[PDB]
């Protein structure tokens, strides 16, 4: 039927893809061994989308783990549910790009990406007719942002008409790991604007904000953060894997979201999110749940949507629910929040109703919005990049290994125009 091949690039990608196969396997009912348990037809009817059968009854994911370092990919293997992946899919690297984009792209990645393209072509080409790919990576790192996006360049060329959904984590606004963030981010984006079919933006700062301010978790680690990205990233593909009264695939999402080919950068949100104390006191219904959906407090990007205007946005509802309230509530936002919505697109919003909720919640909403408040980070990391680039700081960890002077100014010009394009329809 329709299939997705998963690729995880980098430390952030591997550890954000490892929880993804934990949230998806529990959802379908697969033991860490790989055995089905729980006698419901519903569960396994659409399992082609992420598993290949092994004619002894076991399911293996269509995951390709790519890295230049032996270390963190073994941590995926040795954990619980780490034995689910096929070991051939694991393409190691030996020497490792040390948080260098030019090493990750030009030099170090090159000898190995031909091997990744062998394993990724074997999975993709194999099945009946392919539907797309999904890639999880970091735009701060070296292998996550270097060879994560070289994959994107090459796989698009091989399969032009098939979709390619990337989940990238951006450089944090305030405080920064990995002092060469803007070098990694600006070089990554300038050919991610022209090679990724849909890009979804996550910030760790908004994730700490939510894990502290709304969930009121005492100590958020990457374990709790990645659970939140995993719940939202399972949400976009509710429709593929479960029946629905009003179904909506990834390409139906894409048509309804992007008005212009330039801009495919999205802001993800999840609801409901209550603490363990406050779980039993909060009413769970459609009108409450669309309200939490359109909060700046709840958005996984730490950029204020109220500064700008939602172009077109989408809400993927999950659960037992009436389409009348899924209709009339979305009328109610455009009539109440008259200011936060662009005015030359009547009925900006998109709805979908997916009939199988995440386990143990009656109802859940994921939100994917395309907004001109994303220009706040595009201008912010442009300023961080243009501050360093003028005085040539850390340049020669990219100039040494064959990335010359011109592609940095090309990246700046091909990103500063992105800010101004968004301002044109402000």
């Amino acid at each position: 039927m329709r299939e997705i091949v998963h690729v995880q690039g980098g430390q952030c990608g591997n550890q954000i893809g490892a929880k993804f196969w934990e949230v998806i396997s529990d959802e379908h009912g697969i033991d860490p061994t790989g055995t089905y348990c729980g006698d419901s037809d519903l569960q396994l009817e659409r399992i082609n989308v992420f598993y290949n059968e092994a004619t002894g009854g076991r399911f293996v994911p269509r995951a390709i783990l790519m890295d230049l370092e032996p270390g963190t990919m073994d941590s995926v293997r040795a954990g619980p549910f780490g034995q689910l992946f096929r070991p051939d899919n694991f393409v190691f690297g030996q020497t490792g790009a040390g948080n260098n984009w030019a090493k990750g792209h030009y030099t170090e990645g090159a000898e190995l990406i031909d091997s990744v393209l062998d394993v990724v072509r074997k999975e993709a080409e194999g099945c009946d007719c392919l539907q797309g790919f999904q890639i999880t990576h970091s735009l701060g790192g070296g292998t996550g942002s270097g060879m994560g996006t070289l994959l994107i360049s090459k796989v698009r060329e091989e399969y032009p008409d098939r979709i390619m959904e990337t989940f990238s984590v951006f450089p944090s606004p305030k405080v920064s790991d990995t002092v060469v963030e803007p070098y990694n981010a600006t070089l990554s984006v300038h050919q991610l604007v022209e090679n990724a079919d849909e890009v979804q933006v996550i910030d760790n700062e908004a994730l700490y904000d939510i894990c502290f301010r709304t969930l009121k978790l005492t100590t958020p680690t990457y374990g709790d953060l990645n659970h939140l990205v995993s719940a939202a990233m399972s949400g976009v593909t509710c429709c593929l894997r479960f029946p629905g009264q009003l179904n909506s695939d990834l390409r139906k999402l894409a048509v309804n979201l992007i008005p212009f080919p330039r801009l495919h950068f999205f802001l993800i949100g999840f609801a409901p999110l209550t603490s363990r104390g406050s779980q039993q006191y909060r009413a769970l219904s459609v009108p409450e749940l669309t309200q939490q959906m359109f909060d700046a407090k709840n958005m996984m990007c730490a950029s204020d949507p109220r500064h700008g205007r939602y172009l077109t946005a989408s809400a993927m509802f999950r659960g037992r629910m009436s389409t009348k309230e899924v209709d009339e509530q979305m009328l109610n936002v455009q009539n109440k929040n008259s200011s936060y919505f662009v005015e030359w697109i009547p009925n900006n919003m998109k709805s979908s109703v997916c009939d199988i909720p995440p386990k143990g919640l009656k109802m859940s909403v994921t939100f994917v919005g395309n907004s001109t408040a994303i220009q706040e980070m595009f201008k912010r990391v442009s300023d961080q990049f243009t501050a360093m680039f003028r005085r040539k700081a850390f340049l020669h960890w990219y100039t040494g290994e064959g990335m010359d002077e011109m592609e940095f100014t090309e990246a700046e010009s091909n990103m500063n125009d992105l800010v101004s394009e968004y301002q044109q329809y402000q």
Binding site: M1, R2, E45, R46, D128, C129, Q131, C239, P243, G244, Q245, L246, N247, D249, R251, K252, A254, V255, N256, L257, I258, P259, F260, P261, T312, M321, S322, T323, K324, E325, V326, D327, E328, M330, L331, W344, I345, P346, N347, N348, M349, K350, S351, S352
Partner: protein
């Protein structure tokens, strides 16, 4: 002998047809397998030992909607190749369902249609179900009707359209989908009936006191409407009418074939206890503008022609009085050059009920199919919505680069503009 072929295209087509065929099987009293323990022959084909197979095809490019038919309760009701599916969805794109993923399905679809329709010559017509706003409901809706027009030129093609609402849409490309649909719908269909979702939303709120209608409750109501439309063909009646005489008595000009619907009474067990349901009473609620099932208020239009379907214990004398009341009354407006504004219709068998459903048992119901000049608003509205979008070319790249040429939008624009001069000039 005489039959009719049902076609369901798209998601909305398949689900509406699910409620239609569930209602049809109960009404002729056949089990989900297909065996009862020539009246029903107009929809079912005899096949061996008292066994009956429906005359329908389910066309969608989404497998996740047609496969529950192949694995549900109704597995063996339908013949397996009646249910046809693709691999990949149209993805809310008219250009997908017309050009790219179009030719794969429609060659298989014609063969099933031709094999079903070449059994007993003199069949009444086709019934086509679709959502206008959808991708494949709009895309394949064009291409299927083109093939049927060139092949059976002789043929009556009813089209039931789930038209998008004014204010609730749940997509962004539907100003594109609806304007491009109605170009194809104009030259290729024979009678088109418009159904709005928020019409059935607010009829369900006031008449049924459901504040949570899902798509099931909407689809049961559409099925009750179309069960009463074809009631005359299936059972005996005092004055019955088939689908051929709709053309002569509803469509005064080639292009004006857009119809409204209203069913009365739509009442529950709380209400049927306290209404009497006289012929005068239910025909009043039928002509009520809010009980119209299209969200297009007929007060600012002129009823060009009007068709009534009485269904139940209805005597001819009560019909004549009820209609004469309506003509005399001056709140509604009949056009000056149509003095015989009506076509009455009586059928004997009462509207059947789905057990554990939302309606109650009712002695007599009316289904009214109207042609009015009020339709000027429902097309001008989407004329405007398309103009904001196409002002500087939003979501155009989804179509242009994906197999259709820039100019089909402008060509379909003029056809929608020509329709506005047509509705405007008629009501003078």
């Amino acid at each position: 002998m005489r039959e009719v072929i049902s076609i369901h295209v798209g998601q909305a087509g398949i689900q509406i047809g699910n409620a239609c065929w569930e209602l049809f099987c109960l009404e002729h009293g056949i089990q989900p397998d297909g065996q009862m323990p020539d009246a029903f022959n107009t929809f079912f084909s005899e096949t061996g030992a008292g066994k009956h197979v429906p005359r329908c095809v389910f066309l969608d490019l989404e497998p996740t909607v047609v496969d529950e038919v192949r694995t549900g309760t109704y597995r063996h009701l339908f013949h397996p190749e009646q249910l046809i599916s693709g691999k990949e969805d149209a993805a809310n794109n008219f250009a997908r369902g017309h050009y790219t993923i179009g030719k794969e399905i429609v060659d298989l679809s014609l063969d099933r249609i031709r094999k079903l329709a070449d059994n007993c010559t003199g069949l009444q017509g086709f019934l086509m179900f679709n959502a206008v706003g959808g991708g494949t409901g709009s895309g394949l809706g064009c291409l299927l009707l083109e093939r049927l027009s060139v092949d059976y030129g002789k043929k009556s093609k009813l089209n039931f359209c789930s038209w998008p609402s004014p204010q609730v849409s749940t997509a962004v490309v539907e100003p594109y989908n609806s304007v491009l649909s109605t170009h194809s719908l104009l030259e290729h269909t024979d009678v088109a009936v418009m159904l709005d979702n928020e019409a059935i939303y607010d009829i369900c709120r006031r008449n049924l006191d459901i504040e949570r209608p899902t798509y099931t409750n909407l689809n049961r109501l559409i099925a009750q409407v179309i069960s009463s439309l074809t009631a005359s063909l299936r059972f005996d009646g005092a004055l019955n009418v088939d689908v051929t005489e709709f053309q002569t008595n509803l469509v005064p000009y080639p292009r004006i074939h857009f119809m409204l619907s209203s069913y009365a009474p739509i009442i529950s067990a709380e209400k049927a206890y306290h209404e009497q349901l006289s012929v005068a009473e239910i025909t009043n609620s039928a002509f009520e503008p809010a009980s119209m099932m299209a969200k297009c208020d007929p007060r600012h239009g002129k009823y060009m022609a009007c068709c009534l379907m009485y269904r139940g214990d209805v005597v001819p004398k009560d019909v004549n009085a009820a209609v004469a009341t309506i003509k005399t009354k001056r709140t509604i407006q009949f056009v000056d050059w149509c003095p015989t504004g009506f076509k009455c219709g009586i059928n004997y068998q009462p509207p059947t009920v789905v057990p554990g459903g939302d309606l109650a048992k009712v002695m007599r119901a009316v289904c009214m199919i109207s042609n009015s000049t009020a339709i000027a608003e429902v097309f001008s509205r989407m004329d405007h919505k398309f103009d904001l979008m196409y002002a500087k070319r939003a979501f155009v790249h989804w179509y242009v680069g994906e197999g259709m040429e820039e100019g089909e939008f402008s060509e379909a624009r003029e056809d929608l503009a020509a329709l506005e001069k047509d509705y405007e000039e008629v009501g003078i």
